Amino acid sequence: QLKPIESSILAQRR
Amino acid sequence: GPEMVRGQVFDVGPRYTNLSYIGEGAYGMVCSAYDNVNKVRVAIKKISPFEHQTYCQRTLREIKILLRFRHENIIGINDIIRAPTIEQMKDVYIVQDLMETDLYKLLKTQHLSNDHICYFLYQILRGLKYIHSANVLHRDLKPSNLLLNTTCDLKICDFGLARVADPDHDHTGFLTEYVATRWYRAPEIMLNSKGYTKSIDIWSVGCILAEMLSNRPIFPGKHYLDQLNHILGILGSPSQEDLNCIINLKARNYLLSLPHKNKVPWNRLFPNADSKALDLLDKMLTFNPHKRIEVEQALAHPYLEQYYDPSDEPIAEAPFKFDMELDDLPKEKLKELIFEETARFQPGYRS
User: Fold this and answer.
1) Which CATH code fits B99-329?
2) Considering B91, B140, B158, B201, which one is annotated as catalytic?
3) Chain A residues whose beta carbon lies within 8 Å of the beta carbon of residue B116
4) Which of B22, B50, B240, B276 would disulfide-bridge B30, Cβ 3.0–4.6 Å?
5) Residue B87 burial (CB count, 10 A)
6) Angstrom distances, CA of residue B43 to CA of B18, B35, B135
7) Is B27 marked within a binding site?
8) 3-state secondary structure of B220
């Protein structure tokens, strides 16, 4: 079960 | 007595316990475990390479490479376990942080949104940028080598086929043949089998992109020679210019023999894909490796423009050089090099 992209630290920085 | 998984002893306690099987290869096995010291879940690969020169070579490369690399989209080595003396060393255990799944598994269970595909692709290419900036070729990119957590963080694994090729030196005629996994194998691995470049990794990424778009492999050749037919069935027959680029005469003549095939347009194959994704796909799956998009240009493609930021895409500080390549050595000598390379993880080490 795959979470939203914004849960990735890398994506939060972008 | 140490823990045993499916008949393999894993002599990794007392620090690492509760071993569970994940997978295997010809000279090793991977398990999950618990690191009782750092209180974290790990993956542990057991390797037993020392009877074969080629296994020793790949073990040394993987170790040397991954111990230098430090990047958010590449799995790091936490620990290496092996015996205190070279004569007692039969097995080497490499410890990494446990990831939750991989892309192969995810694609069996889930149709990915365009946003997921775009972000995963970004992360693969950001990792690859770092790898290629170090003068390393991965040579086995595929979905099961891309690990993921449910937070969508992606890390490239498995450097067992990876090597250095210092671009100061022409490696034509000196690269190992029959690299990559068949379905992910660039055409020049078949046609310039000892003279390919890091462009093979871009081809594999294109295969991976295609696979995210459709949840099936784009070129599922049933055997070595059928692979090239699958490629040409979609790309169509190469242009005369691209043929005239093939230096190897036997290879060029073999292609001239084949019947003509037309290009299948990307949008008939992937009628629901983002157009920009298909554009980048076309550039990655370009027949001629000298015309194929390079990793920096791929990162700069419009498909990835919401993520591309060269201020946050590290490159290797000290790219590897020709020194790191003379490993064509007897297996006993390679064992000594593996022992030296793993010494820093031992009690009582001194440089």
Assistant:
1) 1.10.510.10
2) B140
3) 2, 5
4) B22
5) 7
6) 11, 10, 27
7) yes
8) coil
Those residues with Cβ within 8 angstroms of residue B38's Cβ, 6 or more apart along the chain or in another chain: none
Catalytic residue list contains B140: yes
Where b means 16+ CB within 10 Å and e means fewer, B306-322 reads ebbeeeebeebeebbee
Instruction: Check CB contact under 8 Å for B116 and A5.
Output: yes
- Contacts of residues B5-9 at CB distance under 8 Å and 24 or more positions apart, as own/partner, are B5/B29, B5/B31, B8/B46
In Å, how far are B6, B118, B347 from B1, measured between CA atoms? 15, 48, 22
Q: CATH 3.30.200.20: which residues of chain B?
A: 1-98+330-347
Contacting B residues, span 103-132, partner chain A, CB-CB under 8 Å = 106, 110, 115-116, 119, 123
- To test the contact with chain A by mutation, choose from B126, B152, B299, B306 the residue with the greatest count of A C-beta atoms within 10 A, namely B152
| Distance between CA atoms of residues B145 and B163, nearest Å | 16
Instruction: In whole angstroms, give the CA distance from residue B185 to residue B138.
Output: 12
B248: nearest Cα among B192, B200, B289: B192
| Min Cα–Cα distance to chain A from B16, Å | 28
CATH class in words for B1-98+330-347: alpha beta
Resolution in A: 1.9
Whole-angstrom distance, CA of residue B337 vs CA of residue B350: 16
Token pair in block for residue B293? 């998009």
Region for B174 from its dihedrals, namely left if φ exceeds 0, alpha if ψ lies in -120 to 50, beta otherwise? alpha
Round to whole Å and give the CA distance between A13 and B242.
Answer: 42
* Residue in the block written with tokens 């690191």: B35
Q: Is B283 annotated as a binding residue?
A: no
Q: How was this structure determined?
A: X-ray
CB B273 within 8 A of CB B121: no
Whether the CA torsion B208, B209, B215, B217 is positive or negative: it is negative
